[PDB]
Amino acid sequence: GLPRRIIKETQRLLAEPVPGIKAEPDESNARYFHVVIAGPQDSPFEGGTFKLELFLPEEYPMAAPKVRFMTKIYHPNVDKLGRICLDILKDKWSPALQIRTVLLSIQALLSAPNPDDPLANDVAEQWKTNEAQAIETARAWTRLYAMNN
Amino acid sequence: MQIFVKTLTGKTITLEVEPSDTIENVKAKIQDKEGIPPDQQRLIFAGKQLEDGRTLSDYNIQKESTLHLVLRLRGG
Amino acid sequence: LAYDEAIMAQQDRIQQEIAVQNPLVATLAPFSILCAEYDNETSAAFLSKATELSEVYGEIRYIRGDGNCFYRAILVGLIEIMLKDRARLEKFIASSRDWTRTLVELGFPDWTCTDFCDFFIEFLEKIHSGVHTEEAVYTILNDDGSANYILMFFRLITSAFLKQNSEEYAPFIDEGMTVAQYCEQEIEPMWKDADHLAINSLIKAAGTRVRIEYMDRTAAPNGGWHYDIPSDDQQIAPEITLLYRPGHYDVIYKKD
């Protein structure tokens, strides 16, 4: 079957939920996780919902979950291919952390509009030189992409 | 002026040094009392590693200050 | 930051090349096997040390260099003791259940940390009952899944022990980190090398007694450089010896 760390973490993640976030395992693969994060209060992504894909590697929890955005989003932390730039998914991962940690942290990049952004994207520099124009763009992209069916 | 060097082993020692002294000399002096050689030593003051080149005054180390000593045992 | 993903694949291609070559915990081997690594021309300094040590030392147990060597080395040392002294084993089980409660009390992530503890306790309990033998334990200690789960416990107590005595150890940390900052970055994650500060904490948290043999190329005092943790007014013999060559730890056994 599975290692106990996944079995338990699933059970706990289903019987307790996280406010603002739907997160349920794939019916065919227990290591595959489909996630909808609903865009948070008073942030450019207000009123939109964003699908995400989380996967737990073989060596987990000794290495971070793999996480990617499906829903297209104007953000200095998330690029064209949906890849998430987050510290606890690379350098600052600890086996003491869990999926709930990944989710909250990602959410708080929007929540909690994380600027972020002392890094160098084409989006980040736009957010650097002027908050004004950039914040509106992300409101527009929420409109175009994050909704609805 | 007297200074203290605290080691992880639950021990403290004391040294007679001058603010002109290089970190190298301080290490040399620790060797004289403990045995640990300069190149196995790391010294730390105010959450910063003291550097082989500079001197006590460069780091603003005063009368009755405590330095901290750890060993080079980093390993994988 | 887009280049990052492709260096994770290097840090895996290298980690796996090291992983196929030699097990996490090797079987015992004669200390002479170590000398074999050195020849009188290309590495004479080490060969001297190796040869001097073989007067005192009988066998060597190689530990895979994967960033966890020190922790893995200690835990093997402990496990071995506990399979020869039953009381020690029983005493360790008791003090382990305490760590669990100490961990949540110190603000660690509840269920995850608790489960690491619970998994180790069940390991120890099955050794005590007789489910695991000398041979099964070493098979578990080599399965990457199991082995690293057990190791996490020792990483956790090393962290716990530091926070438990923060005011005391904080001045030893550097680059301006706090105790908590150091722990989370350096001690809690896997694959992260151990330094003196961590080495001290694990040994004290574990309640054990260790000699480290510092095999470098330098001239040394008679019998080579070594270090006892803890160093005491007492004169109780060390119950685990580690060999330390620059950047690496293996377990070594006194002669008989």
Swiss-Prot record, chain A:
Question: What controls its activity?
Answer: Activity is inhibited by binding to OTUB1, which prevents 'Lys-63'-linked polyubiquitination. Activity is inhibited by GPS2, leading to prevent 'Lys-63'-linked polyubiquitination.
EC code(s) of this entry: 2.3.2.23
Q: One Pfam family of this protein, by short name?
A: UQ_con
Q: Which residues carry out catalysis?
A: 85
UBC core domain location is 1-147
Which InterPro entries does the UniProt entry name for this protein? UBQ-conjugat_E2_core (IPR000608), UBQ-conjugating_AS (IPR023313), UBQ-conjugating_enzyme/RWD (IPR016135)
Ribonucleoprotein keyword on record:
no
The record's Gene Ontology biological-process terms are:
antiviral innate immune response; DNA double-strand break processing; double-strand break repair via homologous recombination; negative regulation of TORC1 signaling; positive regulation of canonical NF-kappaB signal transduction; positive regulation of DNA repair; positive regulation of double-strand break repair; positive regulation of intracellular signal transduction
Q: Can you say where in the cell this protein is located?
A: Nucleus; Cytoplasm
**Domain of life where this protein originates:** Eukaryota
PROSITE patterns linked:
UBC_1, UBC_2
Find the cross-link Glycyl lysine isopeptide (Lys-Gly) (interchain with G-Cter in ISG15).
Answer: 90
Gene Ontology MF: a single term: RNA binding
Q: What does its PTM field state?
A: Conjugation to ISG15 impairs formation of the thioester bond with ubiquitin but not interaction with UBE2V2.
| Keywords for the protein's UniProt record, in alphabetical order | Acetylation, ATP-binding, Cytoplasm, Disulfide bond, DNA damage, DNA repair, Isopeptide bond, Nucleotide-binding, Nucleus, Transferase, Ubl conjugation, Ubl conjugation pathway
What's its catalytic activity? S-ubiquitinyl-[E1 ubiquitin-activating enzyme]-L-cysteine + [E2 ubiquitin-conjugating enzyme]-L-cysteine = [E1 ubiquitin-activating enzyme]-L-cysteine + S-ubiquitinyl-[E2 ubiquitin-conjugating enzyme]-L-cysteine
Gene Ontology CC terms, in alphabetical order: cytoplasm; cytosol; extracellular exosome; nucleoplasm; nucleus; protein-containing complex; UBC13-MMS2 complex; ubiquitin conjugating enzyme complex
Name-wise, this protein is: Ubiquitin-conjugating enzyme E2 N
Native species: Homo sapiens
Name of encoding gene: UBE2N
Curated annotation (Swiss-Prot), chain B:
Mutating residue 68 to G has which effect? Loss of DTX3L-mediated polyubiquitination of histone H3 and H4
Site (Essential for function) at 68
Which residues are recorded with the post-translational modification (Microbial infection) ADP-ribosylthreonine? 66
> Residues where Phosphoserine occurs?
65
Q: Where in the cell is it found?
A: Cytoplasm; Nucleus; Mitochondrion outer membrane
Membrane-topology annotation of the record: Peripheral membrane protein
The record lists the effect of residue 66 to A as: Abolishes CteC-catalyzed ADP-ribosylation
- Residue ranges constituting the Ubiquitin-like domain according to the UniProt record: 1-76
Q: Where is this cross-link: Glycyl lysine isopeptide (Gly-Lys) (interchain with K-? in acceptor proteins)?
A: 76
After translation, the protein is modified as follows:
Phosphorylated at Ser-65 by PINK1 during mitophagy. Phosphorylated ubiquitin specifically binds and activates parkin (PRKN), triggering mitophagy. Phosphorylation does not affect E1-mediated E2 charging of ubiquitin but affects discharging of E2 enzymes to form polyubiquitin chains. It also affects deubiquitination by deubiquitinase enzymes such as USP30.
At what positions is ADP-ribosylglycine found? Answer: 76
Q: What is the effect of changing residue 68 to A?
A: Decreases affinity for UBE2R2 in ECS(FEM1C)-UBE2R2 complex. Impairs ubiquitination by CRL2(KLHDC3) E3 ligase complex. Impairs ubiquitination by CRL2(KLHDC3) E3 ligase complex
Positions of the site: Interacts with activating enzyme? 54, 72
Result of changing residue 65 to E: Phosphomimetic mutant that binds and activates PRKN
Cross-link (Glycyl lysine isopeptide (Lys-Gly) (interchain with G-Cter in ubiquitin)) at residue(s): 6, 11, 27, 29, 33, 48, 63
Outline what the protein does. Exists either covalently attached to another protein, or free (unanchored). When covalently bound, it is conjugated to target proteins via an isopeptide bond either as a monomer (monoubiquitin), a polymer linked via different Lys residues of the ubiquitin (polyubiquitin chains) or a linear polymer linked via the initiator Met of the ubiquitin (linear polyubiquitin chains).
Q: What is this protein called?
A: Ubiquitin
What organism does the record attribute this protein to?
A: Homo sapiens (Human)
Primary gene name: UBC
Shown portion of the complete protein runs from 1 to 76 of 685
From Swiss-Prot, chain C:
Q: Does the keyword Nuclease apply?
A: no
Which reaction is this enzyme known to catalyze? Thiol-dependent hydrolysis of ester, thioester, amide, peptide and isopeptide bonds formed by the C-terminal Gly of ubiquitin (a 76-residue protein attached to proteins as an intracellular targeting signal)
Could you name the active-site residues?
66, 69, 226, 248
Question: What's an example Gene Ontology biological process for this entry?
Answer: proteolysis
Instruction: Reply yes or no: does the keyword Hydrolase apply.
Output: yes
* Keywords for this protein: Hydrolase, Protease, Thiol protease, Ubl conjugation pathway
**EC nos:** 3.4.19.12
Q: Family, per the entry?
A: Belongs to the peptidase C65 family.
Q: What does the UniProt function comment say about this protein?
A: Hydrolase that can remove conjugated ubiquitin from proteins and plays an important regulatory role at the level of protein turnover by preventing degradation. Specifically cleaves 'Lys-48'-linked polyubiquitin.
This protein is called Ubiquitin thioesterase otubain-like
Q: Which organism is it from?
A: Caenorhabditis elegans
Tell me the gene name. otub-1
Counting on the full-length protein, the chain here runs from 42 to 275 of 284
